[PDB]
From Swiss-Prot:
Region of interest called Activation segment, as start-end residue ranges on this chain: 154-163
Further remarks about this protein from its record: Centrosome amplification can occur when the cycles are uncoupled, and this amplification is associated with cancer and with an increase in the levels of chromosomal instability.
Record's GO cellular component terms: axon hillock; basolateral plasma membrane; centriole; centrosome; chromosome passenger complex; ciliary basal body; cytosol; germinal vesicle
Post-translational modification: Phosphorylation at Ser-212 decreases the kinase activity. Ubiquitinated by the E3 ubiquitin-protein ligase complex SCF(FBXL7) during mitosis, leading to its degradation by the proteasome. Ubiquitinated by CHFR, leading to its degradation by the proteasome. Ubiquitinated by the anaphase-promoting complex (APC), leading to its degradation by the proteasome. Ubiquitinated by the CUL3-KLHL18 ligase leading to its activation at the centrosome which is required for initiating mitotic entry. Ubiquitination mediated by CUL3-KLHL18 ligase does not lead to its degradation by the proteasome.
Key words, A-Z: ATP-binding, Cell cycle, Cell division, Cell membrane, Cell projection, Cilium, Cilium biogenesis/degradation, Cytoplasm, Cytoskeleton, Isopeptide bond, Kinase, Membrane, Microtubule, Mitosis, Nucleotide-binding, Phosphoprotein, Proto-oncogene, Serine/threonine-protein kinase, Transferase, Ubl conjugation
Residues annotated as catalytic: 130
Taxonomic superkingdom: Eukaryota
Enzyme class, broadest EC rank: transferase
Coiled-coil residue windows: none
Regulation acting on activity, per entry: Activation of CDK1, appears to be an upstream event of AURKA activation. Phosphatase inhibitor-2 (PPP1R2) and TPX2 act also as activators. Inactivated by the G2 checkpoint. Inhibited by GADD45A and p53/TP53, and through dephosphorylation by protein phosphatase type 1 (PP1). MLN8054 is also a potent and selective inhibitor. Activated during the early phase of cilia disassembly in the presence of CIMAP3. Inhibited by the small molecule inhibitor VX-680.
Protein name: Aurora kinase A
Biological source species: Homo sapiens (Human)
Statement: the UniProt record of this protein carries the keyword Protease: no
Length: 261
């Protein structure tokens, strides 16, 4: 049904590995949306057809205020097009670059919105596996929305870029489950408060070392409550990481967040 002819294309919203994402408006309805463009030659070369299929099937069926909607797709012999909800206030990544660090209230609020969306995902046994600031978008009221389900799957499971958000079991090629998303949640909470992720390093090889050893320290300004939560999430043993419910009910979260479970 849908074809390129049905849309007017506007400015670039962002660039991805395969993805090149544009603002667009549907001609008959004037509906404003985002069009994620992937080149088939690059998809075929990388051999990532299967995860593109996953992205469409999993994201199109999820329904949650804190998850970005996917409406449909089409393709045209050189390109695939994913039709997405437009997020008008951009990425959390850009916001972090602008402010350098978030305060505790802004951080706890984002963590609550994230944990709500992840709780909904895990109840359907969907694990996201690529939670990071460039994949977190902001709606018209500044609410957080998880996007980019290009690495998502069903659990249990086995398995090019940054190691910074991945847990030890995943970077060691081992087996993993839902608890990978709780680790990434810990990494994010730290990066929000401090301005850089806790295992950041100059080379791949050494980042790998800091992650497998769980080697991180806190700057003085990080408070006791934040330290307690982050320390609970960044556990080497997956089974020792908390349930999302315990994250949403953590004293530091409840004291500082401006949104409910
Ligand atoms: N719906 C959207 N609204 C606004 N900006 C978006 C939207 N989707 C993607 N972007 C921008 O484009 C970038 C790449 O999108 P993404 O779907 O994450 O591609 P990739 O799978 O290649 O990472 C994002 O980091 C963001 O800057
Ligand atoms: N049919 C489009 C296409 C072209 C080239 C490579 C992969 C793909 N898909 C990804 C999306 C899938 C949704 O069903 C269909 C297969
Ligand atoms: Mg992305
Ligand atoms: Mg992707």
């Amino acid at each position: 049904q849908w074809a390129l002819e049905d849309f007017e294309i506007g400015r670039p919203l962002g660039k991805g590995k395969f993805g090149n994402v544009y603002l667009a408006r549907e001609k008959q309805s004037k509906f404003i949306l985002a069009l994620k463009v992937l080149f088939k030659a690059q998809l075929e070369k990388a051999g990532v057809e299967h995860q593109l299929r996953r992205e469409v099937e999993i994201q199109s069926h999820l329904r949650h205020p804190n998850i970005l909607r996917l409406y449909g797709y089409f393709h045209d012999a050189t390109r695939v097009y994913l039709i997405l909800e437009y997020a008008p206030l951009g990425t959390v990544y850009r916001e972090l670059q602008k402010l350098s660090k978030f305060d505790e209230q802004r951080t706890a609020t984002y963590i609550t919105e994230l944990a709500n969306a992840l709780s909904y995902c895990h109840s359907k046994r969907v694990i996201h596996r690529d939670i990071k600031p460039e994949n977190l978008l902001l709606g018209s009221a500044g609410e957080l929305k998880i996007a980019d389900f290009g690495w998502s799957v069903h659990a249990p499971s086995s398995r090019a870029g940054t190691l910074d958000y991945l847990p030890p079991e995943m970077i060691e090629g081992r087996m993993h489950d839902e608890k990978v998303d709780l680790w990434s949640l810990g990494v994010l909470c730290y990066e929000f408060l401090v301005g850089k992720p806790p295992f950041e390093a100059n080379t791949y090889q050494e980042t790998y070392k800091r992650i497998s050893r769980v080697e991180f320290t806190f700057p003085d300004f990080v408070t006791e409550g934040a330290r307690d939560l982050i320390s609970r999430l960044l556990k080497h043993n997956p089974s020792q990481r908390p349930m999302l419910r315990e994250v949403l009910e953590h004293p530091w979260i409840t004291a500082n967040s401006s949104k409910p479970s």
